């Protein structure tokens, strides 16, 4: 726990190293803003010192002029550091989103089933911005205090050494209290979390067994047991508030205790020592803050570890990269057009003890047309995903032209292998972007000819801005037929070797596919026809009759 | 509003005692500037010890006493607010259980979890924090504006405040206009982030994942270019808000300086005026931040109030005859479209009833009717010559027993779970005999520390058979007349099914215990006394299995197919 949070902090700061220079400028403007603010009492004292004795117009004018200038410069310097610190928050927040988004895309699809859409957003939106807020907020408060404390103690030491040691020696008395108060507080908060957790668990079990509680009918006991847990929980809030109010009293008494004991000697410093008239008023104005700034300094050191636990839940995504095979790229010099499955065993990564597909041994598919017969929930899409290499096979081997699918390149497999799904994948991009989805340099004539071959060209022609028509997110503007025809236009735009069809021809037009799957275009490779069309099943040569995760 | 205030107030007196205690302390809180003024004017003119010390002693006594009055007052406030927090949380929890089952059945858990604990906690937490500070600084404001009279000085300060809070909000509006664009452009990037990832396998199928990161990088750089203007705007706003402070402070030096030159009001009185004016502005500055949060909080409060505002016949002689006189069981959603319709039931003492039929053919509704959770829509459903509503909840709990379909188990120990729902505490011999009779004694004696073993969440430790056996012992421990079981032993073992069947049929207590349950096991029905062939609510036939087999009806078809 303690080492983990330290190492995770040491990991956190390392991410900010590219934005070092601006933090040094922010440090310089902060030091300037503090050292400016500490100079405002010094002159204001000297104005009161000079003024009582004589009008002294040049001294009076100059002292006010410089004081008023330094205040203006301090106010300016206090702004620009804020402008730097708020800009620093943009750096880490925009950086972490890019790293998080890029890291998630590399992760396996099995995790996506486990992960919740609401949580993944919540961490991406809030939990990042907390982590980006962390370092500037911690650095600003720490650095502003550190410089101001040693500043004030310096500006005290310039005035006198006699009244400083007694005021300094009291700080251990305050620092010792905060260490007890914080250790008391954090334990009570963690106790309250556990108390509220037990009180909540009763509501969770009650909500879980509503019918049980209503059938037997002893609600009064459930309310009484909830009230019993609420009573002991209520005591923890009372202890916290009583301990805090007591600390307010102790601090309020101790503040004036040091102030009175100081000021009394401060009066003697005029009579006996002959220190200075205005310097007493300055030293008081300095003192007033000195203690109050230590309160932040003692708290921030201990408090630093609390916000680290928030980052851990983001870093949990970044931690692990275990899935998939080694990224080695076999390049297809010529289109082999040979799909195979040697003694395959398809099981889901989400749950190991479930029998999905076992002993899928056949292969030998190249010429003519291939068909994949099977009932509802037989696992035809699982075989298509196994052929396309979405999920890794639990047993056997998915060979392609006497070579492993994992050993194939990802771009080469995406280029060579294809799989026309039933439901059309929609995106926010334009018709050209959707038509050239995952294309490095798609040809304009190729995209238009692919759409014309796919039979969406009449729809694309009438559409506003033609090929640059903005597609509505989740398929808003385009119809079901256009959504299906778009997938045909994608397949035509690819012009890939292998091209499976998972229930695509049922919704879309029948005449469109055959022309693409005949002649020179058909020679790219065979097609795994997984669909309900018996006419397509009759026309095809090969017919894999699947049954109960086994070849009939 | 009126209901909000009327419900929340504690005593007529504890809060009144607190309010009087705050005022008397508040004068002691703001006593310091008068003593500071006296301390300053002493240095300029006077040189007496007694007057100076007397001032410091009164200063110290008032400041120390005020701290004690605050320490007590805050204690009484937090003690009273604790009672209100506990009372409101106690009242709101009961209001859930008071409402009918239709809301629980129709609506999901997430609503009834989040609306109860989180909303009531975060409301009362906000109210406790806000109302404390609201009533504190108002008394400070009124008392300091009071002592400020002891006319021209008050006329000055009244005119200044508006100018203090004019420029920050006026310039801050133009600052805020840019923020909504950053929020929208951020939400846009997150929208595209979720939209791109949501359909993962379509991205994974192709090699688009590399390309999308560039589109993400562009959408981020479009924010990055805008952020430069937002970052400097914060610094510009910081200057305008800060400079107004020096404009105010210098104005006081010039306006006060003329009064010092004229020599009407003294330097000490000027120091008090400056201290009170500086304290007043900083006090009021916090007071303005609550009024939005009250409007934010009260919006939830009215919905919590909207959520909240929605003849015990005793046990003595067990008659044991249930008459569904032309009954009609219908759900709360659809009044006309009933689950059970034209019910003509007629139970009796010492007779195993049965209700054979299809999936959702008034099976659960009939059992729920007999238990009397949801009342009958039409006709009548008397038990022992009297309506179920007439019986006392505890008495009906004792008389009627019903094992549910989903074998639920609480988080407590096996003794607590076995003896759940009872006024008097169950004896160890009773708990042991119930577990022995029901057939859970092997499960109870087999586990660690007997009945003291804590049951895990969602039935983790206990199995399906152990949960069903525990549910059987839970019902058996009461020793009730009516015995219900809708889909109880669905995934029951050979050893379990035989035990439940023996307890149902072979057991001596069955003579004084009616058993009307939706039988999963056919043999349990085949070896019963009374039966009914349900069909969309209405009973088609009602007799013996041999009679139904001989006549050839629903039971014959159900037995055959």
């Amino acid at each position: 726990d303690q080492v983990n949070n330290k190492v995770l902090m040491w990991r956190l700061l390392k991410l900010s190293r590219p934005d070092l220079p601006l933090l040094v400028a922010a440090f310089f403007f902060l030091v300037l803003a503090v050292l400016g603010e500490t100079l405002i009492p010094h002159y204001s004292g000297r104005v009161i010192d000079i003024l009582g004795g004589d009008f002294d117009p040049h001294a009076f004018a100059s002292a006010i002029f410089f004081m008023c200038l330094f205040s203006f410069g301090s106010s300016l310097s206090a702004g620009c550091r804020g402008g730097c610190f708020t800009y620093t928050m943009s750096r880490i927040n925009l950086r972490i989103r890019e790293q998080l988004f890029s890291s998630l895309l590399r992760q396996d699809l099995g995790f996506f089933q486990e992960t919740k859409t609401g949580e993944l957003n919540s961490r991406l939106s809030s939990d990042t911005t907390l982590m980006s807020n962390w370092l500037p907020l911690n650095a600003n408060v720490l650095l502003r205090s550190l410089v101001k404390v040693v500043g004030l103690y310096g500006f005290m030491l310039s005035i006198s050494p006699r009244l400083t040691l007694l005021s300094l020696l009291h700080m251990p008395f305050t620092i010792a209290a905060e260490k007890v108060y914080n250790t008391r507080h954090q334990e009570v908060l963690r106790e309250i979390q556990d108390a509220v957790a037990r009180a909540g668990q009763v509501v969770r079990e009650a909500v879980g067994g509503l019918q049980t509680v209503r059938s037997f009918g002893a609600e009064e006991h459930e309310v009484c047991r909830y009230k019993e847990a609420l009573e002991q929980c209520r005591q923890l809030y009372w202890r916290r508030d009583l301990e805090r109010a007591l600390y307010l009293l102790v601090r309020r008494v101790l503040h004036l205790g040091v102030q009175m004991l100081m000021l009394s000697c401060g009066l003697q410093q005029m009579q006996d020592g002959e220190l200075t008239q205005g310097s007493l008023l300055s030293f008081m104005i300095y003192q007033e803050s000195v203690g109050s700034y230590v309160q932040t300094l003692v708290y921030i050191y201990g408090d630093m570890l609390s916000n680290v636990g928030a980052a851990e839940k983001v870093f949990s995504y970044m931690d692990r990269q275990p899935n998939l095979p080694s990224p080695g790229t076999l390049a297809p010099t010529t289109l082999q057009g040979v799909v195979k499955f040697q003694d395959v065993s398809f099981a889901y990564p989400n749950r190991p003890d479930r029998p999905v597909l076992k002993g899928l041994t056949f292969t030998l598919r190249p010429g003519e047309v291939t068909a994949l017969v099977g009932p509802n929930g037989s696992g035809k899409s699982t075989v298509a995903a196994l052929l396309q290499n979405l999920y890794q096979p639990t047993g056997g081997q998915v060979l392609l032209d006497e070579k492993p699918i994992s050993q194939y390149e990802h771009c080469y497999l995406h280029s060579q292998v294809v799989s026309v799904g039933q439901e059309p994948v929609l995106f926010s991009g334009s018709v050209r972007n959707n038509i050239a989805y995952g294309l490095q340099s798609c040809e304009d004539d190729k995209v238009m000819a692919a759409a014309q071959a796919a039979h969406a060209d009449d729809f694309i022609q009438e559409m506003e801005h033609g090929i640059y028509t903005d597609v509505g997110e989740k398929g808003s503007q385009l119809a079901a037929g256009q959504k299906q025809r778009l997938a045909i236009a994608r397949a035509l735009v690819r012009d890939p070797r292998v091209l499976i069809l998972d229930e695509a021809t049922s919704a879309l037009d029948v005449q469109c596919e055959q022309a693409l799957q005949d002649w020179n275009s058909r020679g790219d490779r065979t097609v795994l026809v997984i669909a309900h069309r018996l006419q397509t099943v009759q026309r095809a040569h090969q017919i894999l009759v699947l049954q109960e995760g086994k070849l009939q | 509003v009126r209901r909000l205030l009327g419900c929340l107030g504690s005593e007529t007196r504890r809060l009144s005692l607190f309010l009087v205690l705050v005022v008397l302390s508040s004068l002691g809180e703001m006593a310091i500037p008068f003593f500071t003024g006296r301390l300053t004017d002493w240095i300029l003119q006077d040189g007496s010890a007694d007057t100076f010390t007397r001032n410091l002693t009164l200063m110290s006594i008032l400041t120390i006493a005020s701290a004690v009055l605050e320490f007590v007052g805050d204690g009484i406030y937090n003690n009273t607010m604790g009672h209100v927090h506990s009372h409101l949380q106690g009242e709101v929890f009961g209001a859930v259980l008071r409402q009918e089952t239709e809301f629980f059945q129709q609506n999901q858990t997430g609503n009834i979890m989040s609306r109860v604990t989180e909303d009531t906690s975060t409301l009362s937490d906000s109210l406790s924090e806000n109302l404390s500070l609201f009533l504190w600084y108002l008394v400070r404001g009124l008392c300091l504006l009071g002592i400020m009279l002891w006319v021209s000085l008050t006329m000055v300060t009244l005119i200044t405040l508006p100018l203090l809070f004019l420029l920050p909000k006026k310039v801050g509006k133009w600052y805020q206009l840019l923020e909504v664009q950053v929020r929208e452009s951020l939400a846009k990037s997150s929208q595209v982030a979720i939209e791109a990832l949501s359909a993962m396998p379509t991205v994974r199928s192709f090699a688009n994942e590399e390309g999308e990161a560039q589109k993400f990088r562009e959408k981020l750089q479009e924010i990055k270019t805008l952020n430069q203007k937002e970052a400097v705007a914060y610094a510009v706003n910081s200057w305008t808000t800060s400079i107004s402070g020096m404009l105010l402070k210098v104005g006081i030096l010039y306006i006060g300086g003329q009064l010092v030159t004229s020599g009407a009001v003294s330097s000490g009185n000027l120091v008090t005026f400056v201290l009170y004016q500086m304290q007043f502005t900083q006090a009021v500055e916090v007071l303005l931040s609550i009024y939005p949060r009250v409007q934010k909080a009260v919006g939830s409060s009215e919905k919590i109030f909207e959520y909240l505002d929605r003849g015990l016949l005793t046990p003595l002689h067990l008659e044991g005859l249930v008459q569904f006189q032309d009954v009609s069981f219908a759900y709360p959603n659809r009044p006309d479209v009933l689950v059970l319709q034209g019910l003509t039931f007629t139970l009796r003492p010492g007779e195993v009833t049965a209700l054979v039929g299809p999936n959702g053919s008034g099976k659960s509704t009939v059992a729920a009717l007999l238990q009397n959770l949801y009342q009958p829509t039409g006709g009548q459903l008397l038990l022992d010559g009297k309506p179920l509503p007439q019986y006392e909840h505890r008495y009906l709990h004792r008389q009627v027993a019903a094992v549910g379909q989903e074998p639920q188990v609480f988080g407590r120990s096996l003794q607590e779970n076995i003896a759940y729902g009872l006024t008097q505490k169950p004896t160890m011999e009773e708990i042991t005999a119930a577990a022995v009779k029901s057939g859970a004694h092997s499960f109870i004696s087999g586990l660690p520390q007997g009945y003291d073993t804590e049951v895990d969440e969602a039935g983790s430790q206990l199995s399906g058979g152990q949960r069903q056996a525990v549910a059987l012992a839970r019902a058996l421990i009461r020793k009730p007349c009516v015995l219900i079981l809708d889909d109880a032993t669905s995934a029951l073992d050979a050893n379990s099914q035989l035990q439940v069947e023996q307890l149902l049929y072979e057991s001596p207590e069955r003579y004084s215990r009616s058993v009307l349950l939706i039988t999963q096991h056919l043999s349990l029905v085949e070896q019963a006394d009374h039966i009914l062939f349900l069909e969309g609510g209405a009973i088609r036939e009602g007799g013996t299995h041999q009679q139904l087999m001989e006549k050839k009806g629903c039971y014959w078809a159900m037995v055959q197919a």
Binding site: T86, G118, S125, T129, N133, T296 | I194, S198
Partner: protein, 55 residues
């Protein structure tokens, strides 16, 4: 918005010897951050539905 950083500056500008102190200032960020945590997830679709839909 970067609201949190404004609140710290407001506190560090006017310290005094008040009742709230920096201990509260962090709790305001914890409270407001948890509100954003609640608001973010509830904005789009539904939290119960995972990323991948089909079993």
């Amino acid at each position: 918005m970067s609201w949190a950083l404004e609140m710290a500056d407001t506190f560090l500008d006017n310290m005094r010897v008040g009742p709230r102190t920096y201990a509260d200032v962090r709790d305001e960020i914890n409270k407001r951050g948890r509100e954003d945590r609640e608001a973010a997830r509830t904005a789009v679709h539904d939290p119960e539905r995972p990323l991948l839909r089909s079993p």
